[PDB]
Amino acid sequence: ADNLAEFHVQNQECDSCHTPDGELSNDSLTYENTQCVSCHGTLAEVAETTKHEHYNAHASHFPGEVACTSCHSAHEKSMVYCDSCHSFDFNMPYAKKWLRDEPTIAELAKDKSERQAALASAPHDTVDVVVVGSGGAGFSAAISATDSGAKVILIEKEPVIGGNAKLAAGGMNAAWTDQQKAKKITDSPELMFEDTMKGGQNINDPALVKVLSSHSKDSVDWMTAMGADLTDVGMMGGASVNRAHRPTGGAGVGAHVVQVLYDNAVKRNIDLRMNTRGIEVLKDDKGTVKGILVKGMYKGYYWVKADAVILATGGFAKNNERVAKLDPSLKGFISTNQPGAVGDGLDVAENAGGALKDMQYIQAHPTLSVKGGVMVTEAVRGNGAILVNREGKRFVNEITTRDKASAAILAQTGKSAYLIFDDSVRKSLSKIDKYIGLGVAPTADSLVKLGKMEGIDGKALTETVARYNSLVSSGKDTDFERPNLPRALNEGNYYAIEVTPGVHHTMGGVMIDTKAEVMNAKKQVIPGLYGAGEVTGGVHGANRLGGNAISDIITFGRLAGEEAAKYS
Numbered sequence: 277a278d279n280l281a282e283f284h285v286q287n288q289e290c291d292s293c294h295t296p297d298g299e300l301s302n303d304s305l306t307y308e309n310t311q312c313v314s315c316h317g318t319l320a321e322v323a324e325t326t327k328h329e330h331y332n333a334h335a336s337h338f339p340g341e342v343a344c345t346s347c348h349s350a351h352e353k354s355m356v357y358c359d360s361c362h363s364f365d366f367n368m369p370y371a372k373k374w375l376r377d378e379p380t381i382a383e384l385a386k387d388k389s390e391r392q393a394a395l396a397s398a399p400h401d402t403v404d405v406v407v408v409g410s411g412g413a414g415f416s417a418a419i420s421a422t423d424s425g426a427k428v429i430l431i432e433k434e435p436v437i438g439g440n441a442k443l444a445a446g447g448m449n450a451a452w453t454d455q456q457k458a459k460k461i462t463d464s465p466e467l468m469f470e471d472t473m474k475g476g477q478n479i480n481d482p483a484l485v486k487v488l489s490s491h492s493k494d495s496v497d498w499m500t501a502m503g504a505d506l507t508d509v510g511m512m513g514g515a516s517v518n519r520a521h522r523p524t525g526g527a528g529v530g531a532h533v534v535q536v537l538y539d540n541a542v543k544r545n546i547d548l549r550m551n552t553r554g555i556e557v558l559k560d561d562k563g564t565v566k567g568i569l570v571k572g573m574y575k576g577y578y579w580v581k582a583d584a585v586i587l588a589t590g591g592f593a594k595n596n597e598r599v600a601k602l603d604p605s606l607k608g609f610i611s612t613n614q615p616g617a618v619g620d621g622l623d624v625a626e627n628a629g630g631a632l633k634d635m636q637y638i639q640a641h642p643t644l645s646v647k648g649g650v651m652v653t654e655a656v657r658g659n660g661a662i663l664v665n666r667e668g669k670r671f672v673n674e675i676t677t678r679d680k681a682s683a684a685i686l687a688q689t690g691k692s693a694y695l696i697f698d699d700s701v702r703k704s705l706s707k708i709d710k711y712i713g714l715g716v717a718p719t720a721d722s723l724v725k726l727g728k729m730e731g732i733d734g735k736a737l738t739e740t741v742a743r744y745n746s747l748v749s750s751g752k753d754t755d756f757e758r759p760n761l762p763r764a765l766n767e768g769n770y771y772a773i774e775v776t777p778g779v780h781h782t783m784g785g786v787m788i789d790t791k792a793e794v795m796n797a798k799k800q801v802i803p804g805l806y807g808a809g810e811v812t813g814g815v816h817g818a819n820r821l822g823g824n825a826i827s828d829i830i831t832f833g834r835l836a837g838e839e840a841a842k843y844s
C-alpha cells in the first residue's frame with residue numbers, strides 16, 4: 277500500500293475510522309483517533325510493542341495525550357514529529373522525511389476567497405475569551421479565565437500541546453517561597469527584581485519586572501495548588517541565590533508544569549482545539565476585539581465571536597531568517613526550539629494594531645549538545661559542572677549570564693567546549709540521566725581516559741579538575757570568580773558533554789502593559805487584546821535570566837486570563 281488508509285481498507289470499511297456521514301469530527305480528529313485506539317490500544321499500550329533500549333516513538337517526554345494522527349496520517353504519507361529535533365532510527369509505516377513549510381500569515385492573504393466566505397458566515401462559536409497557544413502562558417490564561425467565570429476556547433496550531441514550555445528543564449524562578457524556606461534559602465522579590473534588571477542590562481521595563489518578581493511566589497503557590505511539585509530549588513546563571521524551582525531530584529520543570537496545566541484544563545472541561553491556527557484578530561467599528569478568524573487543518577476557516585483574545589503564541593527563535601535580520605551574529609545557528617516557534621503570533625498581533633518592542637534582543641543558550649542538537653540545561657552548571665576547552669582548561673565563570681557564556685564558548689578552539697562533571701553532580705540533577713540516555717554524555721573512570729575519548733588534553737583536564745576542586749574547598753574561584761561552588765568533581769566516574777551556543781529565546785515581541793493589555797505604537801490599549809509569555813516584549817530586556825521565562829508565562833498568562841475575564 278502507498279498509505280495507511282489503503283492498508284486498512286484491504287480488510288476494513290471506511291466507517292472503521294470514520295463517523296457515519298464521513299465528516300471529520302473536528303480539527304483535533306477526536307473521533308478518528310478514538311477509533312485507532314479502539315483497535316490498537318492507548319499510546320502507552322502501543323508503546324509496549326515499540327520499545328528500544330534508549331527511545332520509543334510512543335513513549336516520549338511530551339506531556340498530555342498525544343494523538344495518533346500527530347504522526348500517522350491516513351490518506352497520505354506522514355512525518356514523525358520527533359524528527360524535528362532528533363534522528364532516531366525509526367521505521368514508521370508510510371513515513372516521509374520531516375519538513376516543516378508552514379505558510380506565513382502574509383501568504384495566507386492568498387486565501388481571500390475562503391476567508392471572506394468564512395467571515396460572511398455565522399461565527400462557529402460564541403464565547404467570552406479565545407486563547408491562542410497551548411504553552412504555559414496559554415494554558416494558564418485559559419484556566420484563570422475559566423476560574424473567573426469566562427467561557428474559553430484554547431487553540432493550538434500544532435498537533436501536540438505545550439510549545440517550547442514542555443521542553444523547559446532548569447526551573448521556574450520565584451522568591452521568597454515556602455519551598456525556598458524549606459531548603460534554608462533566603463531570598464526576596466526585591467533581590468529577584470534587582471538580579472533581573474541587572475541581567476537584562478537595565479533595558480527591561482521595570483513595571484513589568486515588578487509584576488514578574490512580586491507575583492512569582494503566588495505563581496509557584498498557584499501551580500502547587502493545582503498539583504505541581506516545585507520543591508527542588510537550584511542555582512542558575514546571573515542569580516544571587518538559588519531560586520529556580522523544579523520537581524524533586526532535579527527533574528525537568530517544563531513537561532511537568534505543562535502536564536499539570538493540561539490535567540487542570542481537562543478537569544474544567546476547557547475546549548482545546550488542536551491543529552487550529554489563529555490567523556486574524558477581528559475588531560469592531562470602534563477598534564475593540566470582536567473575535568478571531570482561525571484555520572483548522574482539517575475543517576478549514578471559521579471564526580469565533582468573543583470579547584477578548586489572548587495571544588500566548590511564544591517566540592520566534594526557530595525562524596533563523598527572521599532572527600538573522602535582527603541579529604546577524606546568529607545567522608546559521610541551530611535552535612533549541614519546537615518547529616512551530618516562528619513568530620506567526622507576532623504577525624497576528626501587528627496586523628491587529630499591536631506594536632513590537634525589543635525585537636533585536638535575541639538570546640542564544642550557551643550549551644546545546646553538539647552531538648544531539650538539543651539544549652543541555654544550565655542546571656548542569658548550576659549544580660556544579662565546569663566548562664573546559666579542547667586544551668583541557670577552564671575559560672569562563674560557568675554561571676555568568678548567557679550572553680557572556682555564549683561568547684566565551686564561541687571564542688574557544690573549535691567554537692565549542694565541554695561540560696565536565698562527576699557522579700555527585702549527576703546524582704544531584706536527575707535531568708542529567710536524560711542526556712546520558714540520549715547518548716551525549718560519554719563517560720570514563722579517569723579524566724585522562726575521558727580526554728583521550730573526546731579530544732581534550734587529558735593531563736591538562738586532570739590538573740584542571742584538581743585545581744578547581746581545590747578552589748571549591750577553599751571557597752573562592754580566584755581563576756574566573758564564579759560566585760557559587762556547590763560541589764567538588766570527585767565522586768565516581770566523569771562525564772563530558774560537547775556544547776555550543778544555539779538560538780533559544782526572543783526577548784522582544786508585542787508591547788503590553790502591566791495588565792497584559794496589548795498597546796499600539798502610540799501606547800494606546802487595543803481593547804480586548806492581550807498578550808502573555810514569550811510573545812511579549814519588555815519583561816526580559818537585552819538578556820533573559822535562566823528560570824525567568826517559566827516564571828513569566830505562568831504569571832502573565834494567569835494575569836491575562838483574569839483581566840480578559842473581567843473585561844468580558
Ligand SMILES: Cc1cc2nc3c(=O)[nH]c(=O)nc-3n(C[C@H](O)[C@H](O)[C@H](O)COP(=O)(O)OP(=O)(O)OC[C@H]3O[C@@H](n4cnc5c(N)ncnc54)[C@H](O)[C@@H]3O)c2cc1C
Nearest residue numbers: 409411413439440441444446447554590809810823825826
Ligand atoms: C528546550 C528549552 C528548554 C527551556 N527551559 C527553560 C527553563 O527551564 N526555564 C525557563 O524559565 N525557560 C525555559 N525555556 C524558555 C521557555 O520554556 C519558553 O520561553 C516558553 O516556552 C515560553 O512559553 P509560552 O507559553 O510563551 O510559549 P510556548 O510554550 O512556546 O507556547 C506557544 C504555543 O503557541 C503556538 N502557536 C503559535 N502561533 C500560533 C497560532 N497562530 N495559532 C495557534 N497556536 C499558535 C505554538 O505552536 C506553541 O505551542 C526553555 C525553552 C526551550 C526551548
Ligand code: HEM
Nearest residue numbers: 280281284285289290293300308345348349350351352574
Ligand atoms: C474508505 C474507503 C474511506 C473513505 C471513503 C475515506 C474518506 C476520507 C475523506 C474524503 C477524507 C477527507 C475529508 C475532508 O473533509 O478533508 C478523509 C480523511 C481522513 N480519513 Fe478517511 N476514508 C476512508 C478510510 C479511512 C480509514 C480506514 C481511516 C483510518 C485508518 C481513515 C482515517 C482518516 C483520517 C485520520 C483523515 C484525516 C486526514 C488524513 O489523516 O489523511 N479513513 N477520509
Ligand code: HEM
Nearest residue numbers: 283284288292293308309311312315316344345348350369
Ligand atoms: C487510526 C487512524 C489508526 C492508526 C493511526 C493505525 C495505525 C496502524 C499502523 C501504523 C499499522 C501498521 C500498518 C502496516 O504494517 O503497513 C496498522 C495496522 C493495523 N491496524 Fe490500524 N490504525 C488505525 C485504525 C485502525 C482501526 C480502527 C482498526 C480496527 C478496526 C485497526 C486495525 C489494524 C489491524 C488489524 C492492523 C494489522 C496489524 C495488526 O495489529 O493485526 N487500525 N494500524
Ligand code: HEM
Nearest residue numbers: 312316318319326333342343344346347356357366367368
Ligand atoms: C496512537 C495511539 C498511535 C497508534 C495507534 C499508533 C500505531 C502504530 C503502529 C501499529 C505501529 C507499528 C508497530 C509495529 O511495528 O508493530 C507504529 C509505529 C510507529 N509509530 Fe505510531 N501510533 C500512534 C501514535 C504515534 C505518534 C504520536 C507518533 C509520533 C510521535 C508515532 C510514530 C511512530 C513511529 C516512529 C513508528 C515506528 C516505530 C519504530 O520503532 O520504528 N506513532 N505506530
Ligand code: HEM
Nearest residue numbers: 330331332333336337358360361613614650651710713714
Ligand atoms: C517525539 C515524540 C520524541 C521522542 C520519541 C523523543 C525522545 C527523546 C529521548 C529518548 C530523549 C532522551 C531522554 C529521554 O529518554 O527522555 C529525548 C531528549 C530530549 N528531547 Fe526529545 N523526543 C521527541 C521529540 C522532541 C522534540 C520535537 C524536541 C525539540 C523540540 C525534543 C527535545 C528534546 C530535548 C531538549 C531532550 C534533552 C533531555 C531533556 O530535556 O529531557 N524532543 N527525547
Ligand SMILES: C/C(=C\C(=O)O)C(=O)O
Nearest residue numbers: 445446447653654822823
Ligand atoms: C533555565 C533555562 C534553560 C535551561 O534549562 O538551561 C531557561 O530559562 O531558558
Ligand code: NA
Nearest residue numbers: 783784810812
Ligand atoms: Na519575547
